[PDB]
């Protein structure tokens, strides 16, 4: 029976909430008051990058913490040298409506995707001097929102067709698909061990998938609006989500309940990008008020503003060594902060 | 200079990439972008045929003006999560099927979409080149059935001249930003050949007004 099964699902959800409540003996805010405050964080723009002529929508750091890839709506994908503001490559995309970009851990491949429903992987290193497209991935019936690299041969993708895809680059096929989301998936984050990965959709919920099985282990429903950004903790057992209700939340993977809420009354605009620094103490979140905040992951007190952008901070990322934070904005200006 | 030979050569390569970027950006700025948000089956493909994956790019020129039309109606997803990508488009070409006033009602769906995209926070200053497609079908249909099925407050005459004007006024009553944007309306059909010209004058008027606002004259 349809309604009997719906009632069983409702009872199951109540039981899950009861288990979470029983686990909720204390809270992070009540357990991290005796620790010393992080102190005021003052970061300055070391490198500001010129060369994009339209709204920058995505960025991703390289593993070596020196190279990065910037995606903008002008149709070009500039690979940046952060230490000295040079352009190593400029990639003319087939479609100018790019919305995500990922730098492979090896560095030989960069991937972009957007409203064209295609994840284009570009071979940076080849015996031609070109950055010719290695493979174009098709199969998504919606806009592509996030791209992340497992290795040189596998890339995971989040799209707006209420699904996520794990591709095989060499064959351009759909190895495993992740179904279960009700709204459009906006961003995914990969665990450091790449065994699992999370995904924040528009149904005010973030899930946790087993990449090698395609199954959804865990569901985290904490927000009230769309989830735009997501980022795993450096430890690998937590992940923060940037929602549209101007609140960030730190979930955990072992008690399946929200641990901490990053909210302030003076902020009423949603979060475009969230990424922890090294050691996971600082939560750098970019907002729609031309601003980027720095939060303490263990104390509600804000660390410090990171203003300096003339438009919305579309995306931001922290280096692998944590030395610098690069933030992309809709004003055609990359800025790197230390 | 504290720079190596390879560092200097890489700087030169970066400058060359910058020059290519500037050239491509100037070429793109010489062009015009036209977002095409039709109300589904409301004669969207007819106008595309008259001017000559997920998002379809249509490129055409007229009096040495490189236009770019973006048919995004095939996305079939949430419009709020990518409609900001087109923010800054020169003009939205809205297609409404006049004969769709008998199909709730299809014309009411078109009106709802027009209200949603005209009053969006991104297209406040982005004008709308509205198209009222299938005027021949409207002229044929208005005699068999009246407009009272679609518009209950309508009380005017029955001829096409007044009914089409009433529909245009109803569509043009939806813009709350009557000052910062202007709705260009045209009654097209399958046999018209001047639609691309009308698009040209509407776009050039939009660009002229944008330049005048940017130059301080307004």
């Amino acid at each position, epitope marked *: 029976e349809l309604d009997q099964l719906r009632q069983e699902a409702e009872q199951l959800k109540n039981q899950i909430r009861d288990a979470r409540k029983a686990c909720a003996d204390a809270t992070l805010s009540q357990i991290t008051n005796n620790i010393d405050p992080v102190g005021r964080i003052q970061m300055r723009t070391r490198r500001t990058l010129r060369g994009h002529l339209a709204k920058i929508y995505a960025m991703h750091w390289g593993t070596d913490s020196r190279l990065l890839v910037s995606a903008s709506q002008d149709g070009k994908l500039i690979i940046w040298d952060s230490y000295t503001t040079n352009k190593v490559h400029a990639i003319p995309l087939r479609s100018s409506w790019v919305m995500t970009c990922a730098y492979a851990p090896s560095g030989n491949y960069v991937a972009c995707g957007g409203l064209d429903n295609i994840c284009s992987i570009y071979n940076l290193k080849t015996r031609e001097g*070109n950055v010719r497209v290695s493979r174009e991935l098709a199969g998504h019936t919606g806009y592509l929102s996030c791209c992340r690299f497992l290795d040189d041969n596998q890339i995971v993708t989040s799209s707006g067709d209420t699904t996520c895809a794990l591709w095989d680059i060499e064959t351009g096929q759909q190895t495993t698909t992740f179904t279960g989301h009700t709204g459009d998936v906006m961003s995914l984050s990969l665990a450091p061990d790449t065994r699992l990965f999370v995904s924040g959709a528009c149904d005010a919920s973030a899930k946790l998938w087993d990449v090698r099985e395609g199954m959804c282990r865990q569901t985290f429903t904490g927000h009230e609006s769309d989830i735009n950004a997501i980022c795993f903790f450096p430890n690998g057992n937590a992940f923060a989500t940037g929602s549209d209700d101007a609140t960030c939340r730190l979930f955990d993977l072992r008690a399946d309940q929200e641990l901490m809420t990053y909210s302030h009354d003076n902020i009423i605009c949603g979060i475009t990008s969230v990424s922890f620094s090294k050691s996971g103490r600082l939560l750098l979140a970019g907002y729609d008020d031309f601003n980027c905040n720095v939060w303490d992951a263990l104390k509600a007190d804000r660390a410090g503003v990171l203003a300096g952008h003339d438009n919305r901070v579309s995306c931001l990322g922290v280096t692998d060594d944590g030395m610098a934070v690069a933030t992309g904005s809709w004003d055609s200006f990359l800025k790197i902060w230390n | 200079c504290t720079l190596s*030979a390879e560092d200097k050569a*890489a700087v*030169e390569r970066s400058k*060359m990439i910058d020059r290519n970027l500037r050239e491509d950006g100037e070429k793109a700025a010489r062009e015009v972008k036209l977002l095409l948000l039709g109300a589904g089956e409301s004669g969207k493909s007819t106008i595309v045929k008259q001017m000559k994956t997920g998002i379809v790019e249509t490129h055409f020129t007229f009096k040495d003006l490189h236009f770019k039309m973006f048919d995004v109606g095939g996305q079939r997803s949430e419009r709020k999560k990518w409609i900001h990508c087109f923010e800054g488009v020169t003009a939205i070409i809205f297609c409404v099927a006049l004969s769709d006033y008998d199909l709730m009602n299809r014309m009411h769906e078109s009106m709802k979409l027009f209200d949603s995209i005209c009053n969006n926070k991104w297209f406040t200053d982005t004008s709308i080149i509205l198209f009222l497609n299938k005027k021949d079908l409207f002229e044929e249909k208005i005699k068999k059935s009246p407009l009272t099925i679609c518009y209950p407050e309508y009380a005017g005459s029955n001829t096409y001249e007044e009914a089409a004007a009433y529909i245009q006024c109803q569509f043009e009553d939806l813009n709350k930003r009557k000052d910062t944007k202007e709705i260009y309306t045209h009654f097209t059909c399958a046999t018209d050949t001047k639609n691309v010209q009308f698009v040209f004058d509407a776009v050039t008027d939009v660009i002229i007004k944008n330049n005048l606002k940017d130059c301080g004259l307004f």
Partner: single-chain antibody, 232 residues
Framework: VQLVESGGGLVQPGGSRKLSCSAS????????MHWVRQAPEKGLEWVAY????????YYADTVKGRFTISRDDPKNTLFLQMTSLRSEDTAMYYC??????????????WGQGTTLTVSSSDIVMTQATSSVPVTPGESVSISCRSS???????????LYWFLQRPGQSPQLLIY???NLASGVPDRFSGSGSGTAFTLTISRLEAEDVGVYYC?????????FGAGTKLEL
């Protein structure tokens, strides 16, 4: 990817010549081309360098003002106009493919070369080992010493190793301090102290026989080293 070259001949001294290097198989415009000589019994010597877009053109002190290098990007060819050909310009001119960005591999591919036989303050690198023998399957460490330290302020040591098999064009092995080039077996390894450098190879076969040239790219002119031959 290939760089075939035309030119050469029996030029009476003082005449003129125009060597050409037609490139096919890669983005020629994005690569800064080079020219390298080789006397019949001597080592390599740099000639000229034209960058991407011909922005900067460099010449060696032995050919400056006398030689003229230029490229035709649409035609995918490289020109080296020569005048007043001395009898000391008799060499095997090589067309060298080089690109310049972070993590790039300059001097990737070398051309076949032309046999031009005219009738009749830089960092000097010394290779002490003129010629050493080897037992096939052992390990050798070719060591060459520079004049001034090649370790720049950016942490990059600009030392390049080139292998020239008998009767063949030079091939890049290690394009910096411990940076193996593409298509090179992992047995080739190199490491230096900033002024004195070595190139160590673990196991040797008939592929390794040849002459190894160590070159510096810190500043122009691009001084090479003498020949270091490995004999079975």
């Amino acid at each position: 990817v290939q760089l075939v070259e035309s030119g050469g001949g029996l030029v009476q001294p003082g005449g003129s010549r125009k060597l050409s290097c037609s490139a096919s198989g890669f983005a020629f415009s994005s690569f800064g081309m080079h020219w390298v000589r080789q006397a019949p019994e001597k080592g390599l010597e740099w000639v000229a360098y034209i960058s991407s877009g011909s922005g900067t053109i460099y010449y060696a002190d032995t050919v400056k003002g006398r030689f003229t290098i230029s490229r035709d990007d649409p035609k995918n060819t490289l020109f080296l106009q020569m005048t007043s050909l001395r009898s000391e310009d008799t060499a095997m001119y090589y067309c060298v493919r080089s690109i310049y960005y972070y993590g790039s591999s300059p001097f990737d591919f070398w051309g076949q070369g032309t046999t031009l036989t005219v009738s009749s303050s830089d960092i000097v690198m010394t290779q002490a080992t003129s010629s050493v023998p080897v037992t096939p399957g052992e390990s050798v460490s070719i060591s060459c010493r520079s004049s001034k330290s090649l370790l720049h302020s950016n942490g990059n040591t600009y030392l390049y190793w080139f292998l020239q098999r008998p009767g063949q064009s030079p091939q890049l092995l290690i394009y910096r301090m411990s940076n193996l080039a593409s298509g090179v077996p992992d047995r080739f390894s190199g490491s230096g102290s900033g002024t004195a450098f070595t190139l160590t190879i673990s196991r040797l076969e008939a592929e390794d026989v040849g002459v190894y040239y160590c070159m510096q790219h810190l500043e122009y002119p691009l001084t090479f080293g003498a020949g270091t031959k490995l004999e079975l």
